[PDB]
Design a protein around this ligand. Structure first.
Ligand SMILES: Cc1cc2nc3c(=O)[nH]c(=O)nc-3n(C[C@H](O)[C@H](O)[C@H](O)COP(=O)(O)OP(=O)(O)OC[C@H]3O[C@@H](n4cnc5c(N)ncnc54)[C@H](O)[C@@H]3O)c2cc1C
Ligand SMILES: Cc1cc2nc3c(=O)[nH]c(=O)nc-3n(C[C@H](O)[C@H](O)[C@H](O)COP(=O)(O)OP(=O)(O)OC[C@H]3O[C@@H](n4cnc5c(N)ncnc54)[C@H](O)[C@@H]3O)c2cc1C
Ligand SMILES: [Cl-]
Lengths: 450, 448
């Protein structure tokens, strides 16, 4: 049965949970991982970044993902306005071995979850964390502006649908709960929504649509374009299941402003405002149900505290235009494992480690924030030279600067590919468009240097 | 009813390549006569298929009949070349959940194909043996060379029946689907050239009560192939809807000898395949253990003046990657395309015969170098032949070999894999070592 005591409790067996559980268990930590669903289970989020490989490599899962046979993504196209699309190429930057994947999430989350068990973490499914018990930490615990002291969490109550129930004690907590955000939403209450990105989304899977850039060395790559009226944007993501993932994103007010099988109809109506998406789906056959979900973007006032870490959607969320969700989940899961291991064996104080994790979550989120915002500003405009596109017929100059951030660099040190000089130019270029400790990433010696 | 004296196309041999070519031609309205020396249903080896079977069967509208029969669906195949982790090819990953293939009791599918030829409008006769072919001199503008030959034009065939009846039938085109007998290639062109490295022999039997491989996994009970640990050969397990698993071993003719031997060597090769033995741990033999010749061969030419050679009648490669049934029907399609193109004036006969012969050669060459690379890795048990920089197993190699192993790279009906991907499959194996079809029903032929 589930043990009463462990070293680290990881709440939620999603990508950020399984990654943090595996990375800690591969260091020998007595990790317990609790997941309310039994894998495989459906979840949306199939487009990945090339940063997935260095992250998966640290936990020795990269080749297992390669051997599964997901649809490879060599890049992504972004037709923000009526001008010709901008395109980021993964295999050009990282070589012919540097492609990423478009992923059926029911299977990758299983691969990560089973890898956590094979890594030596105690994994349990159908077990839901009902509550967290924060003991008072009445001692000084300073912040740099991104950690909070609701006390120290030391026990969690859990239930299983087969009727068993109990409580588990732990020394550290990893919050990978997801949108539910148990710590951020239900013990803390520090979710800060961005009113400009309070979006809604609808999607479905289609068979027989014909690929983009047929014959071209960029055939059937993921394709994103903004609506010609500027109200939102749509995506196409082809998958190995034989279907292409298709969906549309609109702000909550602008979504019902077009309410003037309703979900299937607005899917077709919003599709009209994307002429190239409209062209690709001409012969398409619908095989999926068309599903709607909330898609609000939010940050948090704190991402860590006394002996607990918040990772992935449990802390922050940004509009999935640049496929940042799965990247930021595992990138924060690595920072949680690094900061916990540093705290465990005395590389630094807990407040030094907890603050370090919270920054790596905050600055990583900030990078995609200003980049996605610049694209969404260009999508909300159409004729105005956002990204400085006045004299050109495309965005290729803009995506030459946005290269490192769009491909997942700029905060996690494990993404060695791009220099911090190039990243700085990615930040400077994007803000003008809108206008210490060091990880020891060695297996068996994970922690922080000064 | 009896065999007619004249027809448009005579198809010799009612195997898969014969029945497919008969159906594809008869569905175009051609007066096709199909002669088969064996009476269906009859036993024949070859039970593992490729996912390319569906686009081929769909062109002749036979997919749904095969689906309704209930063959064991095949989602992929495993290949444990050496003691390292298995390599695996995934059909459902590439072709979707409806793109699986089958493991097939061949006595029943060959009958379905043969009867489908009759429903397609071909005149089908069983127990009728083509004894000889009458090649008239074709001294016209038709040179030899390029995988085409000019032994003259075949225009009549002598035939015999098991009741004693005999006669002769005239035809404008010939389709040689006779098989290993290879009437045209072995006794009229005399152009079968064996590869001395692949002069293999095989033994097999069917076992009941064996337990599935990879139980519980989404890849449970898929066909499993592994090379013998001493490097002498390889074994297979192919589970069938019959509740039994087809089990067999393949050895080179010299290494084979290194009656009762068949039952004993069956156990010895199984012992040299630890995972095959594990699946057959409680198994009981219900079949006879049978031996047959399994030599690999090519031909200097696969077509000529108004005749087409398809399947084993032309070429054969070691069945490690289950290429035999694919290449049979893939060549049968090319024979129907090239004959119809010649019939309706899309191009000259000399242009069509070269196109068919190239598609037989080009398809065979793909599987040749791929099987050769895998069999070299099996004899180099300890040497990395197909092992690249990796963490374990051969699965990275099978990600490169993916399109050829699943039947792409020559047949135009298998669109699934890009022509970019096929190029890397060719280079990967070698480094270890015009006309366009009109695949329209009722408009079959060639464009330029
Ligand atoms: C429409 C849409 C499109 C998207 N497209 C993309 C894309 O293209 N690319 C991309 O990278 N991202 C995309 N995302 C985002 C992506 O879905 C997430 O960012 C990603 O799943 C990372 O979050 P996570 O790791 O927490 O996963 P989650 O699925 O949020 O993991 C949380 C897990 O914890 C479990 N859990 C919840 N409560 C408890 C509890 N009390 N106890 C135990 N377990 C619990 C849940 O069942 C779940 O399995 C998209 C999101 C949306 C809405
Ligand atoms: C041990 C072994 C294992 C194999 N495993 C596989 C496998 O897993 N998968 C796979 O795809 N392939 C496999 N094969 C290959 C497969 O058996 C053949 O490649 C495939 O069946 C193609 O045969 P065919 O239709 O061309 O010839 P056949 O199937 O032999 O058909 C020719 C027919 O014509 C008849 N005939 C012969 N002479 C005459 C004549 N003169 N007149 C009239 N009719 C005549 C024959 O009786 C026969 O019925 C294997 C082969 C061997 C030896
Ligand atoms: Cl992207």
């Amino acid at each position: 049965s589930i043990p009463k005591s462990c070293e680290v409790l990881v709440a939620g067996g999603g990508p950020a949970g399984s990654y943090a559980a595996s990375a800690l268990a591969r260091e020998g930590v007595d990790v317990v991982l609790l997941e309310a669903d039994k894998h495989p289970r459906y979840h949306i989020g199939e487009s990945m970044l090339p940063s997935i490989r260095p992250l998966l490599r640290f936990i020795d899962l990269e080749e297992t993902f390669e051997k599964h046979g997901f649809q490879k993504k060599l890049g992504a196209a972004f037709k923000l306005t009526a001008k010709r699309e901008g395109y980021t190429d993964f295999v050009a930057a990282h070589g012919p071995n540097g492609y990423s994947w478009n992923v059926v999430r029911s299977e990758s989350d299983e691969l990560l979850f089973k890898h956590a068990a094979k890594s030596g973490a105690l994994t349990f499914q159908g077990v839901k964390v009902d509550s967290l018990e924060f003991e008072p930490y009445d001692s000084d615990f300073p912040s740099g502006g991104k950690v909070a002291n609701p006390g120290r969490p030391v026990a969690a109550r859990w239930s299983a649908k087969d009727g068993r129930s109990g409580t588990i004690s732990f020394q550290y907590l990893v919050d990978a709960t997801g949108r539910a955000g148990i710590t951020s939403t239900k013990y803390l209450k520090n979710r800060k929504f961005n009113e400009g990105l309070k979006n809604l989304a609808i999607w479905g899977y289609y068979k027989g649509a014909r690929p983009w850039a047929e014959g071209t060395p960029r055939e059937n790559q993921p394709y994103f374009e903004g609506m010609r009226d500027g109200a939102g944007w749509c995506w196409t993501i082809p998958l190995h299941n034989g279907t292409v993932s298709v969906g549309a994103v609109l702000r909550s007010d602008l979504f019902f402003a077009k309410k003037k099988v309703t979900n299937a109809m607005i899917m077709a109506e919003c599709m009209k405002l994307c002429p190239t998406i409209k062209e690709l789906l001409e012969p398409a056959e619908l095989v999926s149900d068309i599903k709607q979900a909330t898609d609000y973007s939010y940050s948090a006032s704190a991402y860590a505290g006394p002996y607990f870490r918040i990772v992935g959607d449990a802390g922050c969320f940004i509009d999935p235009f640049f496929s940042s969700g799965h990247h930021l989940a595992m990138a924060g899961a690595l920072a949680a494992a690094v900061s916990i291991r540093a705290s465990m064996k005395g590389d630094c104080s807990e407040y030094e480690a907890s603050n370090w994790h919270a920054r790596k979550v905050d600055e990583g989120y900030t990078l995609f924030l200003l980049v996605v915002m610049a694209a969404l500003k260009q999508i909300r405009m159409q004729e105005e030279p956002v990204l400085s596109d006045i004299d050109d017929d495309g965005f290729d100059r803009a995506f030459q600067f946005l290269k490192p951030v769009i491909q997942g660099s700029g905060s996690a040190e494990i993404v060695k590919r791009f220099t911090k000089k190039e990243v700085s130019e990615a930040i400077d270029f994007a803000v003008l468009a809108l206008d210490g400790f060091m990880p020891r990433l060695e297996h068996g010696h994970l922690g922080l240097n000064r």
